[PDB]
């Protein structure tokens, strides 16, 4: 495929509503998305104070790492809490979700294999 | 388990000094073990450090976490900042130079077949 180097400001890219029957107060900014990326995606996630990405699970894994913020991680049994400077390896099929239980936005990094959209 | 939740400070960086890779620490945050399809990496670049001109047939993504990081491109440089995203095609030549008097840490993602 095609040759050269994208670099670019993620916040250039402007944050769009997420809005699903397990998603509300998220905002999504894709960097390398499907029309770009040979294998696995880019995206940046925004949750707003109080968003919620409720418990699902996926037949593919998600690799995560947290920018800003503190991020509620919701997993099969209980839920833990994470800051910036950690990342997450969610194994496929493993139910997972996320919350912003503080009033300032949380932003992570959010990649999937290709085969999962963007 | 079917998941792992862990601040990457706290993993082990691993010094890389080669004949192309000096001042440059790498961390692997999801390795081969565990990564079905690509893995992730944090890089810290050392005042002056390098990592110099090479090319790979797997595709890079990076997101700059910290600092201002020197982009080796197959002719010339550019220099971005924390907020940063990269994206480099399979088979692009790069490299990367910090220039600054602080530590500079990107986040940097390859499929696996490019190893950790
Ligand atoms: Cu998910
Ligand atoms: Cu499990
Ligand atoms: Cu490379």
Redesign the interface.
């Given at each position: 495929?095609?040759?050269?180097?994208?670099?670019?400001?993620?916040?250039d890219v402007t944050p769009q509503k997420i809005s699903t029957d397990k998603v509300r107060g998220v905002r999504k900014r894709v960097?390398?998305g499907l029309k770009?990326?040979?294998?696995?995606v880019?995206r940046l996630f925004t949750v707003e104070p109080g968003g919620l990405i409720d418990r699902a699970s996926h037949p593919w894994?998600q690799?995560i790492?947290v920018?800003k913020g503190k991020l509620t991680?919701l997993?099969?049994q209980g839920e833990?809490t994470?800051e910036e400077?950690?990342?997450?390896?969610?194994?496929?099929?493993?139910i997972?979700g996320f919350r912003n239980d503080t009033d300032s936005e949380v932003e992570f990094?959010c990649?999937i294999?290709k085969e999962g959209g963007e």
């Open positions: 495929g095609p040759s050269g180097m994208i670099l670019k400001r993620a916040y960097l390398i770009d990326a040979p294998n696995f880019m894994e690799e790492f920018l991680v997993k099969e833990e994470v400077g950690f990342y997450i390896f969610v194994e496929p099929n493993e997972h990094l990649l294999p």
